[PDB]
Amino acid sequence: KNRPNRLIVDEAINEDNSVVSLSQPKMDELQLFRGDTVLLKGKKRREAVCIVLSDDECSDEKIRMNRVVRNNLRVRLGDVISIQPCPDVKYGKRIHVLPIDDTVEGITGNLFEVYLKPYFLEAYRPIRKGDIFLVRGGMRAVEFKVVETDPSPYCIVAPDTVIHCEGEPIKREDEEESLNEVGYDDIGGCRKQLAQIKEMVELPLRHPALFKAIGVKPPRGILLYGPPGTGKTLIARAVANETGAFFFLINGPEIMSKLAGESESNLRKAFEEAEKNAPAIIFIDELDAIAPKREKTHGEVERRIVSQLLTLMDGLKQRAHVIVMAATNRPNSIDPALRRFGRFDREVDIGIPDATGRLEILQIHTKNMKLADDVDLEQVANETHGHVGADLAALCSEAALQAIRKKMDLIDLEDETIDAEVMNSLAVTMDDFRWALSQSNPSALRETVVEVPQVTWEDIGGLEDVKRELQELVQYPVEHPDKFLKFGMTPSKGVLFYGPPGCGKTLLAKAIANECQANFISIKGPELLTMWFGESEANVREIFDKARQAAPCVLFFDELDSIAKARGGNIGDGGGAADRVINQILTEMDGMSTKKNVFIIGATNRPDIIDPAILRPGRLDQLIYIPLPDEKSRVAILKANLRKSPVAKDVDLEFLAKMTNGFSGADLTEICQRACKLAIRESIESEIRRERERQTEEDDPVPEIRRDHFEEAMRFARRSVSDNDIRKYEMFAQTLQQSR
Amino acid sequence: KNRPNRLIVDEAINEDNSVVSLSQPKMDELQLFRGDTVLLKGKKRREAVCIVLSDDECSDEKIRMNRVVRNNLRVRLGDVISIQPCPDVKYGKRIHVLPIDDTVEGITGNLFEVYLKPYFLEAYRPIRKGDIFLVRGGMRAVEFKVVETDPSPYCIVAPDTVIHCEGEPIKREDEEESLNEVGYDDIGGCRKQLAQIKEMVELPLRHPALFKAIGVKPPRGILLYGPPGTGKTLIARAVANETGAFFFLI
Ligand SMILES: Nc1ncnc2c1ncn2[C@@H]1O[C@H](COP(=O)(O)OP(=O)(O)NP(=O)(O)O)[C@@H](O)[C@H]1O
Numbered sequence: 008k009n010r011p012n013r014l015i016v017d018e019a020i021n022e023d024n025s026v027v028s029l030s031q032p033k034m035d036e037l038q039l040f041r042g043d044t045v046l047l048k049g050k051k052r053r054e055a056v057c058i059v060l061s062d063d064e065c066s067d068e069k070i071r072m073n074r075v076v077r078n079n080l081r082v083r084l085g086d087v088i089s090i091q092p093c094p095d096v097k098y099g100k101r102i103h104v105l106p107i108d109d110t111v112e113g114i115t116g117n118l119f120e121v122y123l124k125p126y127f128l129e130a131y132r133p134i135r136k137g138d139i140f141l142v143r144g145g146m147r148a149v150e151f152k153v154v155e156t157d158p159s160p161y162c163i164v165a166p167d168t169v170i171h172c173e174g175e176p177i178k179r180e181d182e183e184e185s186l187n188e189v190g191y192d193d194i195g196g197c198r199k200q201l202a203q204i205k206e207m208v209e210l211p212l213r214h215p216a217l218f219k220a221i222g223v224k225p226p227r228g229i230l231l232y233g234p235p236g237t238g239k240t241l242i243a244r245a246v247a248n249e250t251g252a253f254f255f256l257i258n259g260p261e262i263m264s265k266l267a268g269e270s271e272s273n274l275r276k277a278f279e280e281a282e283k284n285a286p287a288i289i290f291i292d293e294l295d296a297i298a299p300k301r302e303k304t305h306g307e308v309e310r311r312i313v314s315q316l317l318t319l320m321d322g323l324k325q326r327a328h329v330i331v332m333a334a335t336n337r338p339n340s341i342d343p344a345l346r347r348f349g350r351f352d353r354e355v356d357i358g359i360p361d362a363t364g365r366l367e368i369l370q371i372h373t374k375n376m377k378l379a380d381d382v383d384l385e386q387v388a389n390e391t392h393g394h395v396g397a398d399l400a401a402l403c404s405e406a407a408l409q410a411i412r413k414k415m416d417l418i419d420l421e422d423e424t425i426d427a428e429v430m431n432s433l434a435v436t437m438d439d440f441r442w443a444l445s446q447s448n449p450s451a452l453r454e455t456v457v458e459v460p461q462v463t464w465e466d467i468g469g470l471e472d473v474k475r476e477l478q479e480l481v482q483y484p485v486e487h488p489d490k491f492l493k494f495g496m497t498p499s500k501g502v503l504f505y506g507p508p509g510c511g512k513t514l515l516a517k518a519i520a521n522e523c524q525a526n527f528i529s530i531k532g533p534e535l536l537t538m539w540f541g542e543s544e545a546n547v548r549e550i551f552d553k554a555r556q557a558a559p560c561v562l563f564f565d566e567l568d569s570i571a572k573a574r575g576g577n578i579g580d581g582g583g584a585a586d587r588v589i590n591q592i593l594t595e596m597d598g599m600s601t602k603k604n605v606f607i608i609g610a611t612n613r614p615d616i617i618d619p620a621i622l623r624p625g626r627l628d629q630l631i632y633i634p635l636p637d638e639k640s641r642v643a644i645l646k647a648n649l650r651k652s653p654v655a656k657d658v659d660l661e662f663l664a665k666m667t668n669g670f671s672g673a674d675l676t677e678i679c680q681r682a683c684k685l686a687i688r689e690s691i692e693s694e695i696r697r698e699r700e701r702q703t704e705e706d707d708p709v710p711e712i713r714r715d716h717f718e719e720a721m722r723f724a725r726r727s728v729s730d731n732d733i734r735k736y737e738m739f740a741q742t743l744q745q746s747r
Numbered sequence: 748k749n750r751p752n753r754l755i756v757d758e759a760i761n762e763d764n765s766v767v768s769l770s771q772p773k774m775d776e777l778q779l780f781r782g783d784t785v786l787l788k789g790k791k792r793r794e795a796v797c798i799v800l801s802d803d804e805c806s807d808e809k810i811r812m813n814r815v816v817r818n819n820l821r822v823r824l825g826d827v828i829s830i831q832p833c834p835d836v837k838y839g840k841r842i843h844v845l846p847i848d849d850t851v852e853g854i855t856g857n858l859f860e861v862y863l864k865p866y867f868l869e870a871y872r873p874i875r876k877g878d879i880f881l882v883r884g885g886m887r888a889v890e891f892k893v894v895e896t897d898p899s900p901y902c903i904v905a906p907d908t909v910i911h912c913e914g915e916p917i918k919r920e921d922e923e924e925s926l927n928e929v930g931y932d933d934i935g936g937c938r939k940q941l942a943q944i945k946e947m948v949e950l951p952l953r954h955p956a957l958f959k960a961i962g963v964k965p966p967r968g969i970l971l972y973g974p975p976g977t978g979k980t981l982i983a984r985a986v987a988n989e990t991g992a993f994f995f996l997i
């Protein structure tokens with residue numbers, strides 16, 4: 008018809024297996040309501056009946072499409088479908104649905120009331136003939152095929168019908184695949200990297216003939232890496248099985264497990280077999296087993312194997328319908344002659360996930376688990392700092408095995424055997440989650456983390472003008488390069504905080520990285536000391552390579568004065584005013600691109616004994632005095648700390664605010680900690696006294712703090728900063744010379 | 748019967764080779780006294796006669812079970828047994844017990860008064876037909892098989908009887924193992940590590956078909972280490988010969 012009814016498929020955000028979400032101007036163009044019965048026609052004359060729903064997440068012309076119904080239509084991602092309303096659907100009297108025997112194995116008991124009757128209630132579901140849907144439960148996920156309906160050829164189902172499920176399972180026909188093949192639905196986290204790998208490879212695989220009409224070379228050597236266990240083979244096979252090409256898998260240890268000429272014949276026949284079924288993808292994992300760093304290679308057959316791989320990958324420039332993906336452990340653990348132009352050009356890091364990614368990975372792995380009601384995935388989302396996803400698979404399977412070990416075991420073996428009806432009753436508790444998270448958790452990470460921070464501007468009290476002109480200093484030229492191009496001034500890229508210790512030096516950097524949606528990689532002082540004492544400075548280049556790879560980002564140096572204080576004070580050691588790591592930092596600083604959005608933030612508390620070679624233009628040049636807090640900042644910081652804890656309202660904090668002057672913010676965030684420790688000790692002792700009183704039940708004495716704890720904490724209080732350091736810093740206010 | 752008479756075996760803390768220790772609410776439910784003659788039926792219609800004693804170390808539903816009597820019943824750890832009182836046991840007049848030649852080698856002299864008469868005094872011991880017990884001494888530990896009793900088919904023994912030990916030793920039949928195979932009784936110390944290795948491996952070996960109904964991967968690469976000489980091969984072969992699987996050694 009060539010009208011807007013020809014639409015492009017996508018992934019779905021909805022979690023029902025038969026609903027389709029669409030946008031508002033599109034749905035106002037088609038004149039429907041919510042919950043209408045809609046019909047989809049695609050390729051090879053297949054049909055889909057669905058419920059339509061409305062969402063603003065959809066764009067102008069796309070369709071949020073589920074995977075089981077897109078495999079029901081026998082189409083894939085990148086195909087076009089046709090949309091028609093079918094508003095004349097009645098109810099049925101008999102429903103014929105039956106499994107395929109290849110996915111129901113080990114199963115005993117009745118199948119009908121355990122799955123079908125928990126499914127076909129309360130959801131009027133549109134079913135057409137020959138359809139295969141998918142349900143979960145029983146620690147499993149089973150698909151189901153329908154055969155016959157009374158209102159031919161489709162109906163909507165309701166509580167007011169029956170389903171006749173009689174018969175034996177039927178073998179799967181030759182055309183479709185199973186649904187235990189992995190896909191785009193079961194990879195939690197790292198959505199941007201998946202989008203980048205999706206957009207980089209879509210054209211020569213979905214439209215191969217276009218590059219048979221245009222001679223422009225696509226990128227063919229694309230290399231992803233990451234710390235191990237993160238499922239690089241999983242995402243590789245997911246992309247290859249989702250976009251629909253021929254797959255073949257070369258693993259490094261198997262090729263090293265043969266003789267010499269047998270390995271040569273294996274690699275040659277593998278590349279010929281990948282040539283035969285074009286278009287196709289090819290995958291080499293554990294490249295460290297095949298082509299290591301050259302200094303770590305000692306024999307003779309290994310260099311011959313690496314030269315064989317170089318000739319075999321240079322000799323497929325003529326072909327353009329295969330593409331090579333590979334996976335190592337680290338980019339510094341490959342031979343440097345391999346990753347060059349014509350062999351391996353594109354580079355992508357997977358990285359470690361974060362709390363949102365951990366929540367999504369946990370949402371993947373409790374899909375067919377049948378949780379309880381008291382289990383709280385936000386708890387084990389926030390309490391699981393520093394983990395990879397295979398540890399999360401181990402954690403979920405460990406808690407499931409503990410629920411099998413505690414109950415539903417010795418209770419059952421003394422009387423009967425085990426079926427799936429009692430597997431329906433099995434849920435797991437949060438106690439097994441806390442038990443599997445307390446012990447038996449080998450945390451597989453000690454390295455540097457990269458994430459967006461969470462502290463916002465309202466978490467720090469006051470300091471308002473400094474926040475707004477820092478916002479001027481970073482936020483402006485990334486949004487308006489035309490004004491700077493008009494006035495010809497290149498922007499500065501350095502800023503140097505300084506101030507007395509204990510004034511909240513990390514919080515403003517966290518707020519700037521959180522508001523502009525920037526990554527964050529921090530380096531403390533102890534990292535500088537363990538790079539100085541070991542005399543190892545081939546690590547700074549790795550840090551700034553990671554920084555450029557994490558673009559955009561803000562790089563935070565904490566305790567820069569440690570290397571100048573460590574070898575003596577202001578007299579110092581026998582040396583002078585320079586060192587090793589700081590000039591290595593300058594040399595790797597000034598030799599990079601101006602527009603790459605890597606913004607370097609330094610910090611110290613001793614601004615006099617620092618090397619003045621860092622205050623050159625083109626480097627760190629912006630100085631901001633961070634002073635002691637004032638009383639309005641004191642009440643603001645005190646409320647911003649006390650917002651977490653339950654406090655009383657009749658207590659008054661302006662007495663101590665008007666009393667305490669010249670105090671660090673760290674002191675006024677530890678005195679509340681001291682008072683709350685005193686209150687928690689008082690409450691637990693009154694708890695054990697009322698327990699031992701009549702019983703040798705819960706009327707809580709106080710959930711908050713009174714004036715007594717604050718008065719005793721002020722009797723335990725202490726200032727942290729002397730007056731002479733304030734005069735040493737106000738020397739810079741009196742003198743006002745700060746260029747070099 | 749599906750009542751609480753179907754119990755799960757365990758290790759024992761008692762050191763007599765024929766007594767069984769049980770808990771107090773269980774023994775008040777069965778209405779017995781200490782030292783009563785009790786009977787155990789398990790798999791393959793084997794029988795065990797025992798002395799019952801009381802302990803608070805036992806939990807609600809478990810049985811502190813000795814290794815020689817659990818091999819006498821031809822069951823293993825993880826099996827369920829059945830408990831019945833047999834309070835009608837008399838004494839005997841002639842007792843027929845004889846060794847197996849594969850465990851008495853290098854031995855000379857009279858066998859009767861060196862082992863049997865130091866054993867069958869002061870302990871009224873419950874013996875049924877076909878039973879194999881185990882005694883120690885002479886820098887060795889010898890097992891013994893009984894053949895025939897006068898009050899058929901079981902008795903309790905006392906100082907007021909005789910034991911006729913005449914004959915040559917009989918070859919071991921094909922079904923059972925020896926008792927010089929290592930087990931859970933001869934590893935001192937490190938009980939928590941043995942409990943951890945016990946709980947980590949019990950499910951895919953005692954109940955294999957459950958993971959033929961549930962697809963969840965068990966842990967398969969488990970690595971123990973230690974400073975050398977601490978008997979890592981001993982605890983490995985002990986767990987494999989105690990839980991009862993096929994072993995092979997690389
Ligand atoms: N509102 C606040 N005002 C001041 N400090 C705060 C505030 N909120 C949190 N902090 C703490 O301030 C820390 C930032 O370091 P900061 O206290 O400025 O350095 P310092 O204490 O002066 N030097 P040091 O403690 O030895 O590393 C954070 O880690 C918090 O623990």
Ligand SMILES: Nc1ncnc2c1ncn2[C@@H]1O[C@H](COP(=O)(O)OP(=O)(O)O)[C@@H](O)[C@H]1O
Pocket residue numbers: 193194195196235236237238239240241368371395396397398400
């Ligand atoms: N983010 C994740 N999403 C889904 N599964 C994961 C994830 N991370 C780890 N896994 C699981 O951990 C295992 C490790 O992936 P694998 O391909 O074996 O990596 P490697 O071989 O490098 O260890 C996979 O079998 C996968 O199922």
